[PDB]
Amino acid sequence: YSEWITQPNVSRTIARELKSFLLEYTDETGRSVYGARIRTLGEMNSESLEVNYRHLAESKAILALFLAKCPEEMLKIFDLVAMEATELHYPDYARIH
Amino acid sequence: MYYGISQFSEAYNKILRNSSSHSSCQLVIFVSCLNIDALCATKMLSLLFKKQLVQSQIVPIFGYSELRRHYSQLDDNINSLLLVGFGGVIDLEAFLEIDPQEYVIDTDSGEQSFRRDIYVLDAHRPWNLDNIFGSQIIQCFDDGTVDDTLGEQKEAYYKLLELDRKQRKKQIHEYEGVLEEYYSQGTTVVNSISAQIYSLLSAIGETNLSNLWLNILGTTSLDIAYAQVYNRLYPLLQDEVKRLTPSSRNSVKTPDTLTLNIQPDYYLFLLRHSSLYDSFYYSNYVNAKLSLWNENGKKRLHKMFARMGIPLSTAQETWLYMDHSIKRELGIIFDKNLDRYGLQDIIRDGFVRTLGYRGSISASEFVEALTALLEVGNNSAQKLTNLRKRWVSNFWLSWDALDDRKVELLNRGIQLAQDLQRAIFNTGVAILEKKLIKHLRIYRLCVLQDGPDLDLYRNPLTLLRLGNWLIECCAESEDKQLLPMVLASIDENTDTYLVAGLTPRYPRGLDTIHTKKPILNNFSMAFQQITAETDAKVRIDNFESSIIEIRREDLSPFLEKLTLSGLL
């Protein structure tokens, strides 16, 4: 399993799905609560990026199981997707963190 | 047209020859307290006189009756008295109650020589012709701009002078109607006193960098009161700068070298010498645009700051301590972001001057420091005389600060400006959250009863600054139309209310034609009307008609009359 996750091809596909549900997946609301946390943490000017682990299993859950099994690499992927969301919602919020 | 623009130099030479006595002083200077442009003009006159070595006494005044009693104190031999921007509209001669026949020496051909000749340069617009033309002792410097436009009014006034029949009666009545047409008009200013003073200097050709610099400062002071006038005079100031720019280009900065630049300025108080966050924080225009008074204002401020990508702790730290690597890029960053927020109109070119390695100081920063030093540099009527003395002292302190060597005093005024902006912000947010404004659809009414700094607030300039901030806040709220601004403050030491009647003002950047027409302060006429009948013992001795001191108990009937008054 971990060797399969190690493939950067798999990692990039997961990155695509991660960016997809990050803003596109607006669970139970007309707006993505994760997108709401984005640029709010930007306003807070912090680095945490809380997820709650929910709306993840609720969002097709394959990413959820993948994380639960082999986190570290897709945590790094989450950090990357955080970078793109960062500069997206707040341009220039890069190089702050 | 008592004094032609070109004839200003001729009048100046006449004043010289009248007071051409190095042995004996024949010149006295009377200046309105609490006016930046007045201080600039006084500096102008002082430098001119020290060029001519003419003996002179300089006196700061705040009250009209103070002017009268001082004039009583004055010796008749003084053939030269100058007035700076105060009382021009009111008939000073009537206020002075002078007899020209006493004053005229050798009436005969006819010439009018007086042992005291009083020359009045006024910034106020109504410009009473009888004040201008009733007495030759009253010497009025005329911009011409009002005077030529007053040609119909001037000829009507002349006809009234001639006629002292039904057809002639109705003609006189029509002339009186015209008088009332330019009467009942809220006085304003269209000419920064420094501007025409420097024009006269150019006529004499004695202009230096400092003269133009001080003219810039006076105009910048006028900017908030009349933005459009500042904008109109701005190209003239820039052109004169070019006229006086040194030939040397981009020379290495050395302590001897002093340079004044025309570079983009951001409508943030003390921006260079304060931080970024704070400069945004107490900026009245920024506050009104962002509603910073409320918590959501702060939220939006943090959002926009992060939009520039500026780290917070970096933002609250001072501009001077900022790394230049970001400091250079700031302007384009705002260009990219302010527009997205609509805050782009705040960027505009300004005059910032530097000397040696002291640093560059905005003219806006300079005038803010001057205003601060004026405000807080230092029975009940006796207490009010004490406050007038302290205000004169603050005037002298600001005068002294204009000198280059008192950079330390300038920094003190800077600190006072920071503190005053902070306190004004606190008071404004307090009244806004508590909704202490109570608009009566004739005028938005707020009053000061509780809270600290009322002693600071009863200082007229502090009240004026708070009024400007609240006018800016209301105007940026375009949902509610422009309405008169009335503000009343209490002093427990005097136990009577302090009132200033602020005319409504368009938001900055409002170049629409309906915003081109200025607003006239109906407050002044209402106050004069109340003084005329059923007066509540208000004080109008102050050179500002809008600012009025009233018994706290008698203010409620005053408000009732204001509601009754239809001119508001």
Swiss-Prot record, chain B:
InterPro entries: CDC45. Disulfide bonds: none annotated. It is found in: Nucleus. GO terms for molecular function: chromatin binding; DNA replication origin binding; single-stranded DNA binding. The keyword Zinc does not apply. Keywords: Cell cycle, DNA replication, Nucleus, Phosphoprotein. GO terms for biological process: DNA replication initiation; double-strand break repair via break-induced replication; mitotic DNA replication preinitiation complex assembly. GO terms for cellular component: CMG complex; DNA replication preinitiation complex; nuclear replication fork; nucleus. The keyword Membrane does not apply. Assembles into a complex with MCM5/CDC46. Interacts with MCM10. Present with 1730 molecules/cell in log phase SD medium. Required for initiation of chromosomal DNA replication. Acts at the origin of replication. Also has a role in minichromosome maintenance. Belongs to the CDC45 family. This is Cell division control protein 45. It comes from Saccharomyces cerevisiae (strain ATCC 204508 / S288c).
